[PDB]
Write a protein that binds this DNA or RNA. Structure first.
Lengths: 117, 134, 260, 167
RNA sequence: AAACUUUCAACAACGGAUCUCUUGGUUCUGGCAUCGAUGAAGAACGCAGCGAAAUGCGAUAAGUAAUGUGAAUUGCAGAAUUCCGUGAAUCAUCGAAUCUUUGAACGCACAUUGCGCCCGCCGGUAUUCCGGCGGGCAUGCCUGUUCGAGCGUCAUUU
RNA sequence: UGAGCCCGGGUCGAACGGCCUCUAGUGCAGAUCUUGGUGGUAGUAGCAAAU
RNA sequence: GGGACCGAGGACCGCGCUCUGCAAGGAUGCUGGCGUAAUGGUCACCAGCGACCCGUCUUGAAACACGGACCAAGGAGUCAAGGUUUUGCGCGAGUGUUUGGGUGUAAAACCCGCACGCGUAAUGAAAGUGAACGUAGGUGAGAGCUUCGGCGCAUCAUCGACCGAUCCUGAUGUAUUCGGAUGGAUUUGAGUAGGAGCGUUAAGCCUUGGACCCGAAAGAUGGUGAAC
RNA sequence: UUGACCUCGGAUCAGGUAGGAGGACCCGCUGAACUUAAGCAUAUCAAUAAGCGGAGGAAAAGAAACCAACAGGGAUUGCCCUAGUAACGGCGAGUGAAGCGGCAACAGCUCAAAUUUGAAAGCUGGCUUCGGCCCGCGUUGUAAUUUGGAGAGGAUGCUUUGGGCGAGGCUCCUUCUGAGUUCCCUGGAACGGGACGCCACAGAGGGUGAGAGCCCCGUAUAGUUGGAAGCCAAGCCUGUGUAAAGCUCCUUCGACGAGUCGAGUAGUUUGGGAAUGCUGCUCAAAAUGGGAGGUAAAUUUCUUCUAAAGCUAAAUACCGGCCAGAGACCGAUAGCGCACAAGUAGAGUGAUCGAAAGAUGAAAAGCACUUUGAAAAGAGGGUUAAAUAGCACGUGAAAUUGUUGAAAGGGAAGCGCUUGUGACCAGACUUGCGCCCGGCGGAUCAUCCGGUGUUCUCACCGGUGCACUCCGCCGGGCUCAGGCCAG
């Protein structure tokens, strides 16, 4: 499959350690900015759609409104304490809703919140 | 060895900088060591030289010749000292070229700026000496 | 450069004139004009098969093989003659592993390069340090032009524990020429077998040994290999009672007499 | 290329640039994290020493040894098990460890100034006149037109009076 | 036998090969985002004591201001230029200035240092004459100001 | 045996070699081969453009 | 009896004989010569004999033809991606850290959480089905071990057994229109019948990329100019 | 007559804006041919090359009219895998994705659709005493509220505030911060050899008369002087307005983008006639609507989203700009065309083509002076460690040439085997052991003494001696052995 000019459209990977150290420095800079806060926001536990991966679970985009309300965290205040919110997702199952509620409750129990100014 | 990324170990760049440095950098390069009595009197190892320094020679074919510096030819990285001269074919005396690294200072032409330079270098020296000691 | 050799305007004269059929530069007002171009046989032309950046430079080596060879290198370092075999001048140290006390190699006691040098002289690395110091030499070739001017021998490798011994000996032995410093958790085969030759002289420590145990049991998916030979002594294998009893009578001697 | 060679030939100084980066690589300030931060160590190690969780996401690779930085119902609903229509929305009501962690905990648990909001002079005057005229009848004060142009509810008037202090 | 031709040795010519060197080139990697009508990239003409080349600069012309350093320039001529100093330097930095004709090129023409119009000044017989100088005079569009046109259109006896 | 290696004599002035491996822009008589230098023709043909 | 060429091996062993040692599995003994030169080397020349100028190309062969004035330097099967055979190495029914993350003495070295790639059960067009009647079978060889009585690797030939599929045979039974049980077939498989694979290195070969180096006329794109 | 409103124009009026450049990466338009298919036309090359327009440090894309059939996922973007699978194809050449999964990064929003109607609360300009005065825009709609996994309005009871200074901190430039020029030899010069030292969180690099950690610049860590601009910020002063904001509840409401979808049709494009997407022409929509999917399951049941308005950092590319650091790279016919006057010299009308060319010496100390003579030239004489290192200059091969010397040559040379003559050059086994006497001195000699290190039983020193033993040295004496070649 070399009918075209792979000579003009070949791009190498000699900068792999450079990109790795750059990414490490970028996350370190984010940590320096958000010094006491975690680098990444909390994300919910969701399930892989297809039949080939049903029994496996992964991380989602953001927590559901019903899950947030059940966990007792306001919608407008959750992003300020670092909880990803996804308005598109729906629960559709008490199992997933309860799992995400338990995750949010664990986050509350492990979280310390500072009093504004 | 070298750790700071700003410093370079490239001989090419080092030689280019050495051979194309401006006059202040040429002076810094053509700093010269001071003698013993001077070193125990000022607590300084070496300072850049000027036109009014009595100097003694420690290297070369004219070793152990003493005189006052006549000029500092910065373009050729050389200094001209009194009474160290050669005769050309016609007999005219051209001062023989000798290096600050091959001469050692015996007396300083002291002014305000020179006193300030020695004071700064010295003060740094006892500062770090005390920092190491205690 | 990709454009090197063919950044030139030239058209072959063809069979029209009595010259070699090679692309020749156009124009009629320069010494360049009329000269050959585009050829590897012609001056200022392109080279045959120009070097390209997508050549295979890095080689993929199995982690199992790497761990196996590191273990073999450690065993070679434990073997005493292999130090002479690799060239390390090992004659005054009282023990070929040479484990030294973590009490004297930990903390700031060895942070000073003078303290590190005195410790090396006391334990017996002094001859090797003097060897590298006196083998400081100039390299022959264009490496001098390309930034590799001098070559020297290799010194002993200091192995410690960052958890218990710390990171001051790192600088203390960093300054000393020839000697290198390597953590016990990140043993480097390039330092264990320099130039492909086994038998690197390594100054160990007690914490380093107790952590070699832990890391070599901790490596997942890897086990200490079982060797195909139990008694390495082939002299034992041959000159043993059972073999000598089971053997048959010799059919001759080492040097046979000439019959006719 | 010709531009670089012109910089070669010209007797103009080379404008060396300093290593300036948009984002600081280390925290700075008179806070606990900034004071106890170790420059030589990495993010994961610093968070291990502090006692906080760095990444809430799933571990993407092997970690260092011991870092800990990376991490009867009649009506059958698991939510009754999980439980401990309005919620506090501007704050959350929350109920041998590193020095940094205890310092942060003390800072969190320290009491804070109330900064109580008060009322305007004209609001005070209006409430005073309304009390002077209608005594303490919330219905009557809501009913009044002249003294109460903004037809606020009796409950609103009652809470304004309570906040002011006079019954 | 000499001459001529051939082989070899010593020496001497030609030539730039081999070894050595590299202020160069090539490749990779890391940090940052910055040209122009407030005149860009580029072209031309001039500026030094001796300047051919290269560089810098623009009639304030190898350049000025300010700051910093702290006793030079240098091939030759040179200073009564400057040394306990606001102070040398073919110095470094660089926040302030000067910035000729062209060129997107902008009053018209452009192959002329030519030809125009408005505002002001200067000198030479000068309210009149002459010459020079300073400010100016491109286009399309947006906002605002002003002016004008249109039986398009509204009225106006209280 | 051989491709080649070592030494002696002269010159010369700043780096270089043996072995184990690793690597490749690694070995020339041709290609009316490339570049450069130099011959016979020849002190000949002819004074012709160039010089 | 006369003459020519050679002396190979290096304690003993053996075969023997004419047996106090011999000519018996290989030269010793004696004497002399050798440093102002024994013996050599290179160059030049003469002398006897021999002897076409190389490379390429064609032809059964020649013969033609192409290139060669000389010398120095340069000068041509290389590198990728994808296949394949063989050697070595690691692990092994599993194997591959290096997309990435952690770490670091910082393009190195060390580490690994989840996936993924190939393989570890096949067949049928398909619905789909789905690998033991026999120490996973026997018989005979077969390397090898053996208490000499006998055990028998791998593999082969034959007779078997089973599975997927095809053509049948058509059970209890069945919602009364569904089923495949049993016994078969000169059947088919890239099948089972006690796994060999994954990664890496080295060499070789194939395809495409400029593809061992050199060498058309042409075609197209965009510009410069004048003219029968 | 006058004054509006609207529209269209002029002004060398006031304030601004657009050119061009660059174009490595980026967003669009437009768009070939060679080649392959051993011929060639579809196809391929290639949705590429050339041409045209337009930005930035990134651009673009981007918060579903999505993926999917799930036990669901949930903006965009980049890598691995999916995968050479699906799908398409002179079913030849070939072309060729995507979902999912593991990752890196992750951030959500502004409008049009409403009546502020108990008050256009909004904004441009010039005039300023800089504090507030006008003019104009505008109701053909500027502020506040609101954008459909919403919201509005009331009731309701909880909980939030806003500004101005600002010490100091971080980033970056800068000042300063270790140790021999100790003695001897060689040399022109010591940076070389030997002896004796020191420093080192500094043994990277470069200069200095030759290989310099300690002669010099720098080099390492912690500091320390002064300065620029951004961001952060402990704290300290003002708030005020019946001002804004988040929610809970409900006998009240809930507007959502048109020549646009869609149908027919021509072109272009893709793996993709449910036309893959788009453009052009004709016709031309809906409001229990529309789009895309699932499904034979018995009728289009079911699933999932809202198109025709818009913004948005990060992970991503980068032959370009300002720099910086490196290499198992090339080393002056190489490496970019250019290490040096290089896009220079030069050629062509023009677009364009485009070279050759590095090294004296440590330091010019670049040959004073005398003497030839018309010259880029010699003989003396001088500088240098050296001038056969003399601006033709580090070393200086071969081709070719000259002088001297030797030999040879009757219509080819050159080469092979084998002598001979001449010339020059080299120089053979490196040539000794053993025994016996007399003397001398040292020692595993002495059951000698003392000390030290050790493998703890072996060594090495200091001190006595010569009775024995062993070594040598001297002066005698005798023997033997030898390298090559001949008979």
């Amino acid at each position: 499959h070399f009918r075209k000019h792979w000579q003009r459209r070949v791009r190498c990977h000699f900068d792999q350690p450079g990109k790795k150290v750059t990414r490490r420095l970028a996350r370190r800079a984010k940590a320096a900015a958000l010094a006491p806060r975690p680098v990444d926001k909390l994300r919910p536990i969701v399930r892989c759609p297809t039949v080939k991966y049903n029994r496996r679970t992964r991380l989602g985009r953001g927590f559901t409104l019903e899950e947030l309300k059940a966990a007792g965290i306001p919608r407008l205040l959750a992003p300020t304490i670092g909880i990803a919110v996804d308005h598109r997702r729906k629960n559709l199952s008490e199992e997933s809703l309860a799992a995400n509620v338990q995750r949010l409750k664990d986050y509350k129990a492990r979280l310390i919140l500072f009093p504004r100014k | 060895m070298k750790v700071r990324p700003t410093v370079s170990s490239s001989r090419r760049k080092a030689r280019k900088a050495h051979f194309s440095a401006p006059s202040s950098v040429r002076r810094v390069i053509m700093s010269a060591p001071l003698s013993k009595e001077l070193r125990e009197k000022y607590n300084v190892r070496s300072i850049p030289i000027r036109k009014g320094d009595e100097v003694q020679i420690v290297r070369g074919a004219h070793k152990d010749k003493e005189g006052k510096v006549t000029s500092v030819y910065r373009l050729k990285y050389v200094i001209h000292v009194e009474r160290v001269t050669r005769e050309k074919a016609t007999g005219q005396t051209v001062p023989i070229g000798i290096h600050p690294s091959n001469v050692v200072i015996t007396k300083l032409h002291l002014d305000k700026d020179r006193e300030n330079i020695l004071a700064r270098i010295k003060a740094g020296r006892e500062q770090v000496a005390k920092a190491k000691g205690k | 450069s990709e454009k090197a050799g063919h950044q030139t305007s030239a058209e072959s004269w063809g069979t029209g004139r009595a010259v070699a059929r090679i692309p020749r530069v156009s124009g009629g007002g320069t010494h360049r004009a009329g000269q050959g171009a585009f050829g590897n046989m012609c001056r200022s032309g392109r080279m045959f098969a120009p070097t390209k950046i997508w050549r295979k430079w890095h080689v993929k080596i199995n982690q199992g093989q790497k761990r196996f060879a590191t273990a073999s290198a450690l065993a070679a370092s434990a073997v005493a003659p292999l130090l002479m075999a690799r060239g390390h001048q090992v004659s005054t140290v009282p023990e070929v592993p040479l484990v030294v006390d973590s009490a004297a190699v930990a903390g700031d006691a060895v942070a000073k390069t003078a303290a590190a040098y005195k410790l090396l002289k006391a334990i017996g690395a002094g001859p090797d340090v003097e060897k590298v110091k006196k083998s400081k030499k100039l390299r022959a070739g264009k490496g001098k032009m390309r930034g590799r001017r001098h070559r020297q021998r290799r010194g002993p490798l200091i192995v410690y524990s960052p958890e218990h011994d710390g990171k001051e000996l790192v600088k203390g032995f960093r300054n000393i020429p020839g000697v290198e410093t390597c953590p016990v958790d990140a043993l480097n085969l390039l330092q264990l077998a320099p130039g492909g030759h086994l038998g690197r002289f390594i100054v160990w420590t007690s914490a380093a040994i107790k952590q070699l145990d832990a890391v070599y049991e901790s490596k997942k998916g890897f086990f200490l290999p079982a060797n195909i030979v139990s008694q390495a002594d082939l002299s034992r294998l041959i000159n043993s009672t059972e073999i000598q009893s089971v053997l048959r009578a010799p059919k001759g001697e080492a040097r046979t007499k000439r019959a006719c | 290329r010709e531009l670089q060679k012109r910089k070669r030939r010209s007797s103009r100084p080379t404008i060396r640039m300093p290593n300036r980066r948009k984002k600081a690589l280390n925290p700075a300030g008179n806070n606990i994290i900034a004071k106890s931060w170790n420059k030589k160590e990495t993010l994961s190690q610093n968070y291990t020493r502090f006692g906080l969780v760095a990444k809430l996401g799933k571990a993407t690779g092997g970690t260092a040894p011991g870092n800990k930085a990376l991490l009867s119902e009649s009506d059958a609903v698991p939510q009754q098990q999980q439980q401990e229509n309005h919620i506090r929305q501007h704050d959350l009501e929350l109920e041998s460890k590193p020095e940094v962690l205890r310092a942060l905990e003390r800072e969190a648990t320290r009491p804070v100034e109330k900064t109580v909001r008060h009322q305007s002079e004209r609001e005070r005057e209006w409430l005073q006149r309304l009390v002077d005229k209608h005594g303490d009848d919330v219905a009557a004060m809501a009913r009044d037109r002249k003294l109460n142009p903004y037809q606020q509810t009796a409950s609103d008037i009652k809470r304004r009076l309570k906040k002011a202090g006079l019954l």
